[PDB]
Amino acid sequence: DFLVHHAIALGLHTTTLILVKGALDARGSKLMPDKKDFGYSFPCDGPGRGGTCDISAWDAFYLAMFWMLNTIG
Amino acid sequence: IKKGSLVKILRPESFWYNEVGTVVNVETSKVLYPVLVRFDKVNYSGLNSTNFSLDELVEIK
Amino acid sequence: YPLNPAVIFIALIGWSAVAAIPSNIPVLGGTGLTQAFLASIQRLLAQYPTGPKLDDPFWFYLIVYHVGLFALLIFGQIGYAGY
Amino acid sequence: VLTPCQQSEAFHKREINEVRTLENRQANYEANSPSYLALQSQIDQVHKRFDKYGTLLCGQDGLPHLITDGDWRHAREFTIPALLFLYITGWIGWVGRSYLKYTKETKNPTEQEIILDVPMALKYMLSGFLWPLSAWQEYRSGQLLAKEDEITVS
Amino acid sequence: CAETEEKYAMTWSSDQQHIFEMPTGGAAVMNSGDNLLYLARKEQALALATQLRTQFKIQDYKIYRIFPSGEVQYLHPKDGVLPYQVNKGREQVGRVKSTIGKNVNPAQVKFTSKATYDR
Amino acid sequence: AHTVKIYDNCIGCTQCVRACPLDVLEMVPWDGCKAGQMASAPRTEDCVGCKRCETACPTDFLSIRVYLGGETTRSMGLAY
Amino acid sequence: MNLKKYLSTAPVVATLWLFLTAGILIELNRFFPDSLFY
Amino acid sequence: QVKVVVDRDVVPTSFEKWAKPGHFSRSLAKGPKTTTWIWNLHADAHDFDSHTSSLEEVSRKIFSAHFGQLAIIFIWLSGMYFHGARFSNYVAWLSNPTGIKPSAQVVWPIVGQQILNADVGGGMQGIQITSGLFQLWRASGIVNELQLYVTALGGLGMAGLMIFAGWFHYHKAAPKLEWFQNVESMLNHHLAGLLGLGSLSWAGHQIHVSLPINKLLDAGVAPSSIPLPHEFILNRNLMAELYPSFQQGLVPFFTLNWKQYSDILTFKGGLSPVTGGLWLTDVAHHHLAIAVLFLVAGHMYRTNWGIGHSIKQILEAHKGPLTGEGHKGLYEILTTSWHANLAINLAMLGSLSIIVAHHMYAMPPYPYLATDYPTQLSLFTHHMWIGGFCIVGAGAHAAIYMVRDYSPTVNFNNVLDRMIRHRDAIISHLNWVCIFLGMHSFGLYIHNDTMRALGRAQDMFSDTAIQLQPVFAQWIQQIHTLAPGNTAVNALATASYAFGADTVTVGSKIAMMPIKLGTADFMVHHIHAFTIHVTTLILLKGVLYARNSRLIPDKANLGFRFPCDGPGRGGTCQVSAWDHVFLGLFWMYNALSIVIFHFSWKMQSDVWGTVTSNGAISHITGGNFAQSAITINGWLRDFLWAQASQVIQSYGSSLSAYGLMFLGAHFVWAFSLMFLFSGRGYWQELIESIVWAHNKLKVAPAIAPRALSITQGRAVGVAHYLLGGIATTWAFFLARIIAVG
Ligand code: CLA
Ligand code: CLA
Ligand code: CLA
Ligand code: CLA
Ligand code: CLA
Ligand SMILES: CC1=C(C/C=C(\C)CCC[C@H](C)CCC[C@H](C)CCCC(C)C)C(=O)c2ccccc2C1=O
Ligand code: SF4
Ligand code: SF4
Ligand code: SF4
């Protein structure tokens, strides 16, 4: 019960790290502050400024769905 | 305003928003962004030296 | 590209007769290399569903005959490279 | 139910099981074998291992559980390595912070983190020992924190 | 294909029979005097323009955009001028008054057919 | 079409035009900078939107922004 | 002269130091094995 | 012509440039303004063809780095001979090999891990060897520990000669490019000097060491009455009793009376039923055949004396009409670029390593190798995986040659770029073959899966159902049964017992059994044809589309490790020639995962196991392949679930480290996925949101903490996918068969 319930709280806090991340950095981050202009599920910003794979607010969904299935796992 | 002055920025989209930096160039030739400022740390493009206007340009003492 | 498709049959005598008269006894063919095949096709030719995987002188002298026959007709087309 | 561990029966069954099960490997070698001597020292490392758990709380499994309430009857379980550990990583955190606020003002700060100034590094490595009342005296000075650093839009 | 899609016909001239590389792939013969080249899409053609221009002098070159109704267009060069070189004939379109910092929030563009930068 | 908009950080250092492999961007003489240049994007119907411009745009934050708009034949960049 | 400057880099110091703390734990777990108290 | 032109005192040997990390690249000596300088410090650390375009300075760097590699290999082999000397039970193993399990590494006694010391007999415990070194040493004739200490000492001595060698060839005597592009001499000395004198001198070792010693051990003499290998050469009278052909000397050699050497050298094949390995008479005769045949093979390259070929006049004469120009250009391709040579040599090296794997299960060449099955297993398995990865390096370095060192001027209408003129017709028919083989290699498993699940087992592809007996493999396998009398005329037994006669039982353990291939083995071969064609699809797509695709018509301008082009063209993520190598590593893990899962389960059902009296047979799984390989529930149940029982129940026992390398290697596997699925546009401002928490406390790192780059952030996902996924099968295999074999 101890070690698992800590694992569950790990799942809740990771999954809210992701969701609260790309829900509060949904609008603009210091990588790209243009994010509010592109809508929700825009793909990327290209390789520019280091590379921008999955910057959108849709990524927080896209990754915390893995953490959802894991945590409910 | 002057060259070499340590300047904090007030434009929220710069990488160096609320970080002080040294003024390299001040141009008096009607440029909308005349003040070329470089920094200690570096943004994602590998480029510290950018430029700014006068409203986004706060010196210190 | 196939500029000279002149003859094919010259390979056949070019491959049967170079393997018929050499017997080289203690192998599958106690006779020559091609006599052990042409003798071993007329037993099977008149609509015989036999010839299993243990049929040595037919199946082995299929591949060991055609792998030299193919090569010698291909080299027969190389026999129209000097033209 | 948390029984005291020295009198839990299934705990002593784990004692018999690991001593005897480890002794099943001891039934291969002669009396002067170095392997056999290693299993002598290993049986020592099982009886000492189980007698030195005399004040834990092995429950119904015979496995020594812990307590994290700070009951002061179980402070040697958790809270004493808690204070010890927070001292060690308050050391490490204070050394890292003091070294970075050294090399933030050098000639080439980018070079200073590749190639550590082992002079000034092993200065701070040792000098961060009294970090509770050095962070408490820098925190009253208005120097531990910062203000008006970088942020995104809003 | 040529029945329904735009074939881009890069035309150019040279001085010597050199060897360039196609955007299709593999080397090409490079007729010395004057030669055309029908291509598929524009990035192939201007990638060939960078393929030639970063090597050596290949100028007086431009693709005629063959569109399947029949007529041509003039890409690249447009104005006998190289595009990063400044000619005082190109009229600017595609600018706004300031940076991103004065773009409106998309909750002001919401339920309207505008863009988040139009001001 | 991918709407390419070129803001007023554009100090006219022409890495955009030299970086774009499509000649959608040119340089326009604009007396607002030190170099007197500011890029323009007239032929955004040919614009792929590969954002190779925004890689080589050495402004503070991205004078030239490439908004991913419609997808025509040329803007999808398909060969056939 | 510059050899110590190589011995002051990030991975070399990290191995001469994590080798040392790893030696603290391994030598401190032969001498005091099975330390669940304190 | 041929001469040796070597610069002396080239580079000073100071420690000064060690204090400048990233001295080597002018694009990288700027100093780290970001942490991506750190990782690019290592990925550019061996871009020798990207430091400077000067091929001389590059070629000095690589040719000196080779001696660093051989220095690590001699440190490694000296490690194996010393761990055989000091730590191993090899002298005890040499008494009875079928009883004592081989072990070298004796785990230090700290908390718990002394339980990893497996009581493997020999009066001494320790973790069990599966690398099979002892079987290499009994074949070598190493009798007591002194030759292992001495050969480890010579291993360190050769390691010192390689360190001093590479130091000597970068700094104070380093050759010109005219030395390096002397390729007729390089082949002329590797075909003859390396391989030729290697196999000839090794035939000398086997005849004058291994044949008398492994005749005395074949008689069963303990390693005390065996004399030194040494003591067989001082007098022939200790060998004339063992082989009377040594009494005649070399006189029947020089008189060409080579009938007299039938005692020393023969052509038997098969397996010695006492030792379970090859006859070392056959193996020494074999290395004489490589000796004369390679030493003849060396002398086909004209160097100084106008006798031999050049590569140029060979390649130019193959000017065939369907290629037009012929091979005009490849000698300038393969003597100017190193990545091209690395593509060829890695392809042939890896495929040689797979050939090594097959020829070690089915013709076990070392004595008592097929009697301890883990060494029989993993020496198959390991030479598969380096047998795999080195192919993908081909697909890497044939791509890099197409990106970096390709030149259309020298390479105009030849055999090379005429492929690239129809690379759509290459990749399109690889595409068709991949889908055809995928349907007809895996749809048969979904088919038999459903038909066994729908109850209609008559409609499967079993033995009893619709049979798919592999006709050609059974037929040519029957030709190999009929080898030693018919066509291999002077043979006695077959080429292997994976083909022909009755099995070989050595100490109630089955050395090699005639493998039957029926209607399940068929479908696994079409798996292997399939997953070989997919990696050939990705690694020919990565070379033909390496430079100018019709999607992106400038990849030569972008580079090799570029991530992408952008969201344009609807998105062009993962499009570079590097990215196809990134995918070829996953499909490498697939293709070899099912090569070894085909191995380690057909050869636990159809070869391995024990025998009892009256010649009775008992496999490890007990014939449970052909009724169970045809589905996937039979595959996953009967192999990946049932064979886990000796890995998963391994706690408390000596196999338990594998039970730790089973779980944790799952971990790393799944830990790969975080790098594969996400991207750095998330992690960069997650990290920067943590950089807020450091800027608040003035713990701002001076080297600015970026996320990983895209090609790094996926490369690390491959490199954990393979370490995790490979180490799962590693601990599963060795934890399986040690608990039986
Ligand atoms: C200079 C040392 C130093 C200090 C004082 C801190 C302090 C902090 N970090 Mg941390 N961090 C460091 C180095 C450091 N970090 C390094 C090197 C990394 C990269 C691995 C990280 C990665 C990191 C993450 C990802 C996160 C933090 C967070 C935090 C905060 C919460 C405490 C915590 O869980 O730590 C976290 C500790 C670790 C992740 C591992 C320990 C880091 C190293 C190994 C120990 C320090 C040794 C250092 C190398 C010594 C250098 C100086 C010496 C050579 C002279 C705290 C302010 C968290 C935060 O924002 O909370 C508010 C958070 O999410 N840190
Ligand atoms: C017949 C002579 C001979 C022999 C035996 C070798 C052997 C070797 N060469 Mg080599 N080479 C030769 C002639 C020879 N070469 C000539 C004439 C040229 C010029 C055209 C080259 C050019 C060349 C290059 C460019 C490279 C090699 C490499 C290698 C190594 C391949 C790795 C290997 O198989 O590991 C097996 C290892 C061994 C069998 C160990 C053998 C070492 C012993 C001491 C024999 C070495 C003899 C040595 C040449 C004597 C130096 C003479 C000097 C004192 C005057 C191998 C050691 C590659 C390598 O790894 O670099 C080292 C490599 O990149 N060679
Ligand atoms: C289990 C997961 C899985 C599966 C099934 C596949 C399947 C495939 N991959 Mg693949 N791939 C995977 C994971 C997978 N991949 C992963 C994880 C990676 C990461 C590296 C890749 C990377 C990769 C690359 C890089 C490439 C492929 C390609 C292919 C195709 C090879 C051709 C073939 O086998 O056709 C046969 C199809 C099958 C065996 C799938 C099962 C179909 C059954 C047999 C029949 C149809 C079922 C049913 C009748 C459907 C109708 C009913 C329904 C409508 C209701 C094939 C579709 C290649 C490709 O795209 O072109 C060849 C290619 O180039 N894959
Ligand atoms: C791709 C692999 C594969 C293959 C070979 C088969 C084959 C078969 N399945 Mg099947 N099956 C598969 C995958 C496959 N399945 C999968 C993946 C599923 C689950 C999604 C199923 C589910 C399934 C069910 C549920 C059933 C079958 C059944 C059958 C059998 C009869 C089906 C039939 O009428 O064929 C249809 C064949 C054709 C329409 C002909 C097309 C193919 C021709 C031969 C191609 C020829 C091209 C030619 C060579 C071109 C060159 C010539 C040209 C140049 C002139 C047959 C043995 C049935 C059965 O009872 O089994 C006995 C049945 O009930 N299957
Ligand atoms: C007569 C000398 C001789 C002898 C005694 C051996 C003996 C052996 N070889 Mg062999 N081998 C030889 C010559 C010889 N080889 C030659 C000349 C080659 C190169 C073509 C090879 C290539 C070779 C490979 C690749 C492998 C062996 C292996 C083996 C071992 C397996 C046991 C067996 O049944 O093999 C019997 C050996 C054979 C049937 C090989 C016959 C090769 C003939 C002589 C080639 C003649 C070439 C000639 C130019 C004519 C070409 C045309 C021809 C194909 C019709 C055995 C020790 C295997 C091994 O490593 O064991 C684990 C293995 O994988 N050999
Ligand atoms: C997690 C993750 C990161 C973050 C990884 C971080 C940046 C690296 C963490 C490991 C480094 C090495 C930790 C740094 C620690 C230093 C070595 C110092 C610590 C002290 C000792 C260990 C020496 C990415 O950058 C990334 C990029 C692209 C796709 C996916 C991902 C991704 O999944
Ligand atoms: S890969 Fe991810 S980041 Fe690089 S371009 Fe394609 S999408 Fe943008
Ligand atoms: S915007 Fe950036 S790129 Fe475009 S011109 Fe001005 S500087 Fe050169
Ligand atoms: S959008 Fe893509 S194509 Fe149009 S300019 Fe910017 S980068 Fe070049």
- Every domain of chain H and the residues it spans: 1-741
Residue appearing with tokens 């594969």: H676
Q: How far is CA H674 from CA A65, B23, H687, in A?
A: 13, 42, 15
The answer to whether residues H580 and H538 touch, using CB atoms and an 8 Å cutoff, is: yes
* Spatial separation of the C-alpha atoms in residues B18 and B8, rounded to whole Å: 6
Ligand 3 centroid from CA H528, angstroms: 15
* Spatial separation of the C-alpha atoms in residues E103 and A14, rounded to whole Å: 33
Structure-token pair, residue H710: 């895209």
Structure-token pair, residue H206: 């086997």
Q: Does the distance separating the beta carbons of H706 and B41 come in below 8 Å?
A: no
* Spatial separation of the C-alpha atoms in residues D153 and E99, rounded to whole Å: 14
Distance from CA of A16 to the nearest CA of H (A): 13
The answer to whether residues H276 and H295 touch, using CB atoms and an 8 Å cutoff, is: no
Q: How far is CA B17 from CA A36, B7, C18, D151, in A?
A: 18, 11, 90, 7
* Spatial separation of the C-alpha atoms in residues D5 and D12, rounded to whole Å: 9
Ligand 6 centroid from CA H579, angstroms: 21
Other beta carbons less than 10 A from residue H598's beta carbon: 19
Structure-token pair, residue H513: 């059994």
Residue appearing with tokens 């010698």: C72
Q: How far is CA H281 from CA H205, H242, H264, H292, in A?
A: 12, 12, 6, 17
CATH classification for the domain delimited by D1-154, as one of 2.40.50.140, 1.10.8.110, 3.40.190.10, 3.40.50.720: 1.10.8.110
The answer to whether residues D72 and D78 touch, using CB atoms and an 8 Å cutoff, is: no
* Spatial separation of the C-alpha atoms in residues A31 and H691, rounded to whole Å: 13
H/E run at residue B58: strand B58-59
**Adjacent-strand bridge partners of E9:** E38, E64
Q: Is the Cα dihedral E27, E28, E29, E30 positive or negative?
A: negative
Structure-token pair, residue H17: 């440039």
CA angle D59, D61, D65 (to 5 degrees): 45
**Adjacent-strand bridge partners of B7:** B21, B59
The answer to whether residues H513 and H376 touch, using CB atoms and an 8 Å cutoff, is: no
| Mutant choice from B9, B10, B13, B50 vs E, greatest count of E C-beta within 10 A | B13
Neighbours of chain E (3+ CB pairs under 8 A): A, B, F, H
Neighbours of chain C (3+ CB pairs under 8 A): H
Strand bridging mode H617-618 / H504-505: unpaired
Q: Which domain holds residue E8?
A: 1-119
* Spatial separation of the C-alpha atoms in residues H441 and H434, rounded to whole Å: 10
DSSP H210: I
Interface residues of chain B, partner chain A, Cβ below 8 Å: 12-13, 15, 17, 43-45
Q: Is the Cα dihedral H550, H554, H560, H564 positive or negative?
A: negative
Burial class (CB in 10 A: 0-12, 13-18, 19+), E82: middle
The answer to whether residues H268 and H285 touch, using CB atoms and an 8 Å cutoff, is: no
The answer to whether residues H733 and H595 touch, using CB atoms and an 8 Å cutoff, is: no
Break chain D into its structural domains and give their ranges: 1-154
CA atoms within 13 A on the CB side of H80: 13
Distance from CA of G35 to the nearest CA of D (A): 9
The answer to whether residues A71 and A15 touch, using CB atoms and an 8 Å cutoff, is: yes
The answer to whether residues B13 and F65 touch, using CB atoms and an 8 Å cutoff, is: no
Residues of chain C with C-beta less than 8 angstroms from the C-beta of H485: 26
Coil/strand/helix, residue D132: helix
E7 φ, ψ (degrees, to nearest 5): -95, 130
What number of residues does chain B have? 61
* Spatial separation of the C-alpha atoms in residues G8 and H89, rounded to whole Å: 43
Q: Which residues line ligand 5 (CB under 6 A)?
A: H 267, 269, 278, 282-283, 285-286, 289, 293, 359, 363, 365, 488, 495
* Three-state helix/strand/coil letters over H4-42: CCEECCCCCCCCHHHHCCCCCCCCCCCCCCECHHHHHHH
What number of residues does chain A have? 73
Residue appearing with tokens 């099981």: D17
Ligand 7 centroid from CA F68, angstroms: 14
Question: Nearest ligand, CA of residue H691?
Answer: 1
Burial class (CB in 10 A: 0-12, 13-18, 19+), E15: exposed
Residue H657 contacts E where some CB pair is shorter than 8 Å: no
* CATH architecture of the domain with residue range F1-80: 2-Layer Sandwich (3.30)
| Mutant choice from D110, D120, D144, D153 vs H, greatest count of H C-beta within 10 A | D110
Q: Which of E44, E47, E59 is nearest to E7 (CA)?
A: E44
**Adjacent-strand bridge partners of B51:** B36
The single-letter code of the amino acid at H699 is V
* Spatial separation of the C-alpha atoms in residues B14 and E101, rounded to whole Å: 9
DSSP E66: E
Q: How far is CA B40 from the centre of its chain?
A: 12
DSSP string for residues in F7-35: -TT-----HHHHH-TT---EEEE-TTSSS
What torsion, rounded to 10 degrees, do the Cα atoms H711, H717, H722, H723 define? Answer: 120
Alpha-helical segments (H) within H411-497: 417-420, 423-453, 471-481
* Three-state helix/strand/coil letters over H581-641: HHHHHHHHHHHHHHHHHHHHHHCCCCCCCEECHHHCEECCCCCCCCCCCCCCHHHHHHHHH
CATH 1.10.340.70 fits H1-741, yes or no: no
* Spatial separation of the C-alpha atoms in residues H381 and H726, rounded to whole Å: 11
Q: Does the distance separating the beta carbons of H550 and E40 come in below 8 Å?
A: yes
Q: Which residues contact D107 (CB under 8 A, 6 or more apart)?
A: none
Distance from CA of D144 to the nearest CA of H (A): 6
E–F interface: beta-carbon pairs under 8 A: 95
Helix axis angle for H521-544 and H577-602, nearest 10°, is 170
* Spatial separation of the C-alpha atoms in residues H423 and H433, rounded to whole Å: 15
* Spatial separation of the C-alpha atoms in residues H324 and B49, rounded to whole Å: 56
Q: Which of G33, G37, G34 is nearest to D74 (CA)?
A: G37
The single-letter code of the amino acid at H473 is A
* Spatial separation of the C-alpha atoms in residues F12 and F39, rounded to whole Å: 6
The single-letter code of the amino acid at F24 is V
DSSP D106: S
Residue appearing with tokens 């095949």: C37
Distance from CA of F16 to the nearest CA of H (A): 15
Structure-token pair, residue H146: 């002194």
DSSP string for residues in D44-104: HHHHHHHHTTTTSEE-TTS-EE---S--SSSTTTTHHHHHHHHHHHHHHHHHHHHHHHHHT
Question: Nearest ligand, CA of residue H69?
Answer: 2
**Is F53 annotated among the ligand-binding residues?**
yes
Coil/strand/helix, residue H116: helix
Q: How far is CA H657 from the centre of its chain?
A: 25
Q: What is the resolution of this structure in A?
A: 3.6
Q: Which residues contact H304 (CB under 8 A, 6 or more apart)?
A: H1, H2
* Spatial separation of the C-alpha atoms in residues D134 and F18, rounded to whole Å: 56
Work out how many domains chain E is built from and give that number: 1
CATH classification for the domain delimited by B1-61, as one of 2.30.30.50, 2.40.30.10, 1.10.10.10, 3.40.50.2300: 2.30.30.50
Alpha-helical segments (H) within chain E: 42-53, 106-109
Question: Nearest ligand, CA of residue H370?
Answer: 5
* Spatial separation of the C-alpha atoms in residues H239 and H247, rounded to whole Å: 8
Coil/strand/helix, residue H196: helix
Strand bridging mode E7-13 / E34-39: antiparallel
Residue C27 contacts H where some CB pair is shorter than 8 Å: yes
Q: F16 in ligand 8 pocket by Cβ < 6 Å?
A: yes
Structure-token pair, residue H662: 């089973």
**Is F50 annotated among the ligand-binding residues?**
yes
Strand bridging mode F64-67 / H6-7: unpaired
* Three-state helix/strand/coil letters over E43-56: HHHHHHHHHHHCCC
Coil/strand/helix, residue H73: helix
Q: F17 in ligand 8 pocket by Cβ < 6 Å?
A: no
H/E run at residue H490: none
* Spatial separation of the C-alpha atoms in residues H192 and H179, rounded to whole Å: 19
* Buried-state track H327-346, b at ≥16 Cβ within 10 A, e below 16: bbbbbebbbebbbbbbbeeb
Of D109, D149, D153, the CB nearest to B18: D149
Helix axis angle for H680-695 and H710-738, nearest 10°, is 100
Q: Which residues contact H593 (CB under 8 A, 6 or more apart)?
A: H725, H729
CA atoms within 13 A on the CB side of H441: 20
Q: Does the distance separating the beta carbons of D35 and H695 come in below 8 Å?
A: no
CA angle H308, H314, H318 (to 5 degrees): 155
Structure-token pair, residue E101: 């910092």
Residue D105 contacts B where some CB pair is shorter than 8 Å: no
Q: Which C residues 52-71 touch H at CB under 8 Å?
A: 53-54, 56, 59-60
Residues of chain B with C-beta less than 8 angstroms from the C-beta of D149: 18-19
Coil/strand/helix, residue C3: coil
Structure-token pair, residue H235: 């007098």
Coil/strand/helix, residue H675: helix
For C63, nearest residue in chain H (alpha carbons): H476
Q: Which residues contact E18 (CB under 8 A, 6 or more apart)?
A: E30, E56, H409
Residue appearing with tokens 């080798």: G19
Q: H67 in ligand 2 pocket by Cβ < 6 Å?
A: yes
Distance from CA of A18 to the nearest CA of F (A): 25
